[model samples]
Target chain A: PGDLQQSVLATGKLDALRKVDVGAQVSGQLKTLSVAIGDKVKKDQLLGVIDPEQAENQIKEVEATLMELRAQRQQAEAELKLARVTYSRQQRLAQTQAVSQQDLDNAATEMAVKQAQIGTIDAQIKRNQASLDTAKTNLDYTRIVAPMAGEVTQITTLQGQTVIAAQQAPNILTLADMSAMLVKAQVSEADVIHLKPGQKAWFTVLGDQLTRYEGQIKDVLPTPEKVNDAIFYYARFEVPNPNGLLRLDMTAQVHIQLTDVKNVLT
Target chain B: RPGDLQQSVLATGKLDALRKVDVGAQVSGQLKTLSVAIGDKVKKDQLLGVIDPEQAENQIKEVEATLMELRAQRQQAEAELKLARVTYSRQQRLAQTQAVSQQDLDNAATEMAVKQAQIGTIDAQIKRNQASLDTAKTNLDYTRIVAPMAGEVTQITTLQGQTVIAAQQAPNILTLADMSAMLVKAQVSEADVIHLKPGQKAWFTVLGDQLTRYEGQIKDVLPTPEKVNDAIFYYARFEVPNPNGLLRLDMTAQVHIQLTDVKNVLT
Candidate 1:
């Protein structure tokens, strides 16, 4: 493999800093969506709403179940308190030789059983509380919200259309952080040798003749993936897009200068 | 506060040292013009390059002409299908009125159904052909390589008038790297392997000066390493901040692993 005169040539592309898919978790008749395609949104902002009737009814059912459990626990506690008072009096009378030992033993046995019953009710209450909390959380899911600050790229569901969340999660919309972006470059194994992290790079667009953005390597992935015809590695890089000029799926050309070589023999 | 000690771990490596992707065409052709170049940053799904698009455009035109001709043929088939359905209906009425024989009516019905199915098959073929034409047009468009992410281009291998070939291995056209984050890979000896786990906090110093330490963590550990001079050195990777661009690839880093610590009780 030989000549020192031969140079290494590598190629890649500039791409979005980051992209993500957003979907809805709850199944319900869709309400009005606030953002459309290309509308910028912030984190935790409500994206849309689902009909709250079903979720609200489920919450009510859980509340009623919790209340019933608490009532049973209260009844058990009261019986245990009464049994404890009777057992204490019987023990005192037995110590003074005023009551028979059999009578005192029977009273103590009753108190012990009552205490066990109270303990069982306490455990039930704890379980019911957890269920209640889960019900409340599910009720809140009716309000669809953005997980992060980004632009809404796609909206598949419309108002009044029922979404089914079976097999796969129903897609409601997609959000991407357009302000700061990165590229997932697929680099081949042949050219990967000359590449390194922190290497300066640049890219341009088709329509913008004189415009180009500058950035550096954030990471060069270690793994190599063979995709049928070619072996490639993913290289990630970031770029600033404050002006909102950058959009998702736009094409870009990239250049990476590994190093300059001089005349040599292989 | 809970007695559990809190710690933060980071993984850092050279951005350019890892992998370099070449964004070029699969087939050989003249580069029309580059939309992106060295030092220019881009985003995912961002457009990058355009090969000579004239040929692709012409091919699309040809496909469009073919599609138009097929559409006219489809219209003729639709008329045939309509005529068949009408004939079948007429035959059924005549047979019920005893104006036509049962065998004749059955034949007419069968002929009509066959024609209908034939027309349906033709319609589907047209759709499939249209999709192929659209894909051909897309591949032609792909002749112009575009940037997939937002980053700076490190190199440009091809220029105007250079012919690229998809038959052989694809040519290296350019290199792009993300510079926001960094990671470092260290080869630790077998003896130290026991002390490492995912997310274990550690610090590293370039071999030259131990005093200047860069804080990091044990992000991952290679399960196996090949023999070298009868000693096995497993790769233990970690991360560190390179905000100032001081760290580079193949830089000798001496990593210090902290397994346990003694506080008030001193020997």
Candidate 2:
């Protein structure tokens, strides 16, 4: 009754501050589901489990290969030591005219070949170790965990269901944070130029006309969306919801306070 | 007969710092002491200046005092909880001996439960106060500005005794530049961008020193285009080592890019 201001009216819908699609990083049968729709979860909380039998078998296979390589490397080491001893003895014999120079050369070549074989085995062992690490990581991915603290809003799969993960990740559920909500309003090109960030705004929900939520403009998108012959810009604002009354996708009637005027008689 | 020849594209650009950062005040206060001046070389994490931190220090003191009060309150709650437990046990013994009514025994048990709940509430409050104290201490530490990397101080925007407001945007206090290697940002047209790829050889000469050539490899060709004066242009970047520190910012240069070359051709 006392204060006056110029405002712009726009319609918008409520959206979650953050929405995440929880997907399976590895392909397997869904063995267990710990969370469902309407359930609240914390960051890194276990949400589901997948069959890890294949990944476990792969890790065991790499381990066996590594063991075989180690045994072969040990044999190569023993042969190199024997060759070195023989080559030294041959060198002493050739000096005394007891052996030919060719005999000493043969022993030296044997030692070099054995040393090169050990080097090849060492490189193979390193490659196998890297493979084992990757297998272990894939096994850990079977146990699905939440990426952030939020309320579960959708579930795409159930327990004991087989999920085939191919080029794209297979989504299991969707999680959204409900502590704060955003309103995405479309302002016409004429009114968008006057809209600046941090402008005070208020809105009333379609179902709850008695209560009004207050917020401040967060941003006005630089690009505009065109529909037919008109262009519209998206202006976003945030409102806190401590009571958890605001639901997602609710229609809102918004009024943005653009300019404030002082004492004038009507 | 010409058997093999080298192809190249030419453009113009200026030398710039490889990395630059604008140091700013994280907490609002009056500019106090500045330790470094313009053109001064600084080491990584070296102290640059100090902001007036009297308000931030007082804030820490207040939070610490509040935390102490909460601890005292928790101690009193623990004492009350202990007294309630003793009274409940005594009432239970008396009721078993038919010395106290059932209602009296029930009341003592309820009082014990209430005291236990009160202690739980006090513990939660104490945790909140501790977190607040930690935050206040961090704010106090933010008043001291330091260099993020080893660089030369290129500019100082504010002087001592100037008030800074950091609520919205962090006000820039000074600018730093890493002069070890200089990047040349060249404008390539749409036709020339197709021939440019990462790792291609490039050479350039400054306007003043046309005889001396600096060679480098193309780092990247930015995807975005600059819309200036109704014309589109893309930036191609490359880094050249400045061991002698001869290059300066905004110096004009002529660039040559080698797209491909054929070797051992029959002439």
Candidate 3:
């Protein structure tokens, strides 16, 4: 007796299961790129850094102003304190008319200005503190981290290149999980009729055509692609590439098995 | 019959004060006051007279102005020091970030030290000026002639309302006599004074109060003698209290100096 199997044949490209585009969050020169394509990385590991020279300069400016402004704040507060006492004493003396009205008014006006001056300094300090925190955060952003555990798949930004991140974050590099791979198969519309989700599938690279990796059909695209007067559909499947032979954009020869016949006469 | 030979000498003497002083001015301008008459009694540090002090007052003003000037300079130096300190602080803090050069910081520190030294110098000047002002004020106090002793005024050399010049010597203003006690200077012939000795009992009666007798012991005998009518005489002196003021200066006294226990004899 002979075993009988119903299958469909297709061709597709291999891709990582997860791919993320990491980019520069702040505008600056790319100071360093810690990895090249194909370098393995852990989640939260240092990937690259943008130049923080400008950011550090900003911090120094803010701190200098804060130093002097804080001193002025103390001075204003002291003046206000003195004015309060002076005005109170003036009021007592004015009761006997020993203090002239013009002088009392001048003293009270001084108190008002001092109070306003204190408010102005307080507001300035709060704004400066916020700016300081923002500037520090900017410095932190200069360093890039691996969003997740993956291998470096692509690099878009070169070291020492000035990057502009005003509108969209400028892409720095791409990281992908290389532990497992997805194979998107281009099936003929006729064969896609037989291909369905949960159907057994297998794929092989041209470099290792003898060894076949096995998985099941996850989904198939509903829309057909017109390729050179022939209609095709994309069918997706996953396979663990523990030996790391599979790579991004590698051509994958795929097959989806419809049914398995056991011990049946041919 | 005599058990002992007792000899006595009676002589005419003059009553004089135990202590006399001629009060004068060290730096005289005028005898502005006469607080006591010839007989008026006075105590130590009593205000007897004064000299005009306008010149001393003008000198005080001069030093006072100088002190004020020094104080202002000190304030200026203090302000300058504060600025220097701020400059140095800025430089030092900037050095941590390497914003400023070391030489810049050194310059600021040097300036700060200079300002500090300037303050010290001004402080010394102010101290000296204050001393000068104090001395000038004390010179004003020197114009007043407070009495130097407790005594009765016996003589007046300078009257009030005239300037007394004190050049090489102090100008004498008045003569003061201590009247609490009186001394009797008795003249005795050379042969008779040999019999008198110190600590011997003595008595004197002034011509004004002959009935009242003043008793004392012989104080001293002068070695030098005075020749009166070609007769050499020595002075035997004794001191007696004149608390009642009955004894006056130069009052004639009949002094009796007694010698006792010459020898043991029997008649």
Candidate 4:
């Protein structure tokens, strides 16, 4: 009697744990691209800089409008102070029979009107403040930052290239998180039913056929990727990439455990 | 250990190319392009063809319209807030001069507050719409099919102008096979299988080249079996290099498998 190791052979492809396309959110010339393809990056690292001119111009416009509104509010407040003084004298004169009640009513009405006008100016100021804040936010968008830590895999928009985000927000570059590598193994439909999650799996890279990289089945996708009218499901697994030897899109000779019979006659 | 003693068994089997994968249409649309033909060599991630992306594109346009509507609604709300602010200002000043009641000024302030809160709600809605646009854009990208591995396109089941309903199932566009190696599965009787073990030497002879022996090693003995005339048979499989692509699929194999010393574990 002896032990038997049964495994199913499959084809697999290496991929990064996650991938993202760094896109431009505003229309501007790419001033600088801080990273190149194959360069490792950290989260929030500067990826590129877009021309901040237009966004700055927007901020300036909102600020100028704000200044005018503030000035109007100040003038309205000043006029209210003068009207209050005039109304107080009119009130005293009317009680002493030196001025008519109509004069008193007119002065009070003027003061009230000036106060109400100040409220309108304040409203204008608040509206401009919101615009100025949004303008600043758009300006920040000019400085592209990495959304996550990864390696720069692609750069579609080159330095000095213009991107108009008003329509299609084109990708400036691509980043792939490669700390750990995921393998998508195409297990045949005939063999997939025997697979279960956590079953030990291993694969050999075509580039390095002798060395085997081992992992366990992370998942067996419910759906299949059909070819030639044949069904094949993806058996996903992960392996460590501390030394960065395994690269994205590399081919693999995948093998997974089906079952083991201990001390069996066959 | 005896050097002179030897034992073996005979079974019939077939040959299969190593690692044959199916190229699929991930998104549903009319197959608009077909670039490569049968026997054409393809590289990894190469463009195979495209499905018409009109539906995916239209989805994005719809999302964009909703986004614009949300943004315009915010602007409308801001305008209402400004109007309410102006009216509230007038009421506050009139109240101070005893020309208007306090309740009138309070009512205007409340209206402005409601409009202000509505702006926050609309901003969140716009963000959600942006997320939908991203999904639509990704779906559009999927309409273009690409090869996932390097191999030869051996078969094309899908044709140009064929509409694939991917929601039902991923439709197969073509077949790719890595002919660098070929695997063989030989069927042996259940009674004889107890004497077989993995890593044993094996050989096969095809009808076309009966004189030549394809030498290989046993890779595994599958547990599952097939029956013919109530006779149970197990598959003993192995792999051999096919650098010249000489071997064809389902080729008849007269497989000779080596035997071990122990048959029933000395029981």
Per-residue lDDT value at B16 in model 3: 76
Error of 1 at A82 (Å): 3.4
Candidate 1: tens digits of C-alpha lDDT, residues B1-267: 323333222222212233335676664444546676555668876777766455555455555555554555455455556555666776577668885688877887787788788777777877886897888677786776767655567666664333344555666777776555556666666666666678867777653343767776667876876555886777776666656544434444556566554343423
Docking class of 4: incorrect
Give DockQ per model, in order: 0.01, 0.01, 0.00, 0.02
DockQ, computed on Cα atoms, for candidate 2? 0.01
Q: Scored by CA lDDT, what does every candidate get?
A: 0.63, 0.75, 0.74, 0.75
Question: Which candidate has the highest TM-score of all?
Answer: 4
Each candidate's number of clashing pairs is 101, 0, 0, 1
- Per-residue lDDT of model 4, residues A144-164, tens digit only: 877678889999889988877
- Per-residue error at A27 for model 1, in Å? 2.1
What docking grade does candidate 1 earn?
A: incorrect
lDDT of 2 by residue, A1-266 (tens): 36666789987767788888899877645667897566889999999988676566566556655665665666566566666666776688787986688777888898799889889989998998998898799988999999899888777665534455655577888888878878988788888878889899888875447678889998787888886789988799989877545556555788887877677643
DockQ, cand. 3: 0.00
Candidate RMSDs in order: 33.7, 33.3, 57.7, 18.9
User: After best superposition, candidate 4 residue A174: deviation in angstroms?
Assistant: 0.8
Winner by TM-score between candidate 4 and candidate 2: 4
Off by over 4 Å in 1: A1-14, A92-98, A183-190, A220-236, A261-266, B1-267
Off by over 4 Å in 3: A1-266, B1-3, B190-195, B222-233, B263-267
Clash pairs (backbone) in predicted model 2: none
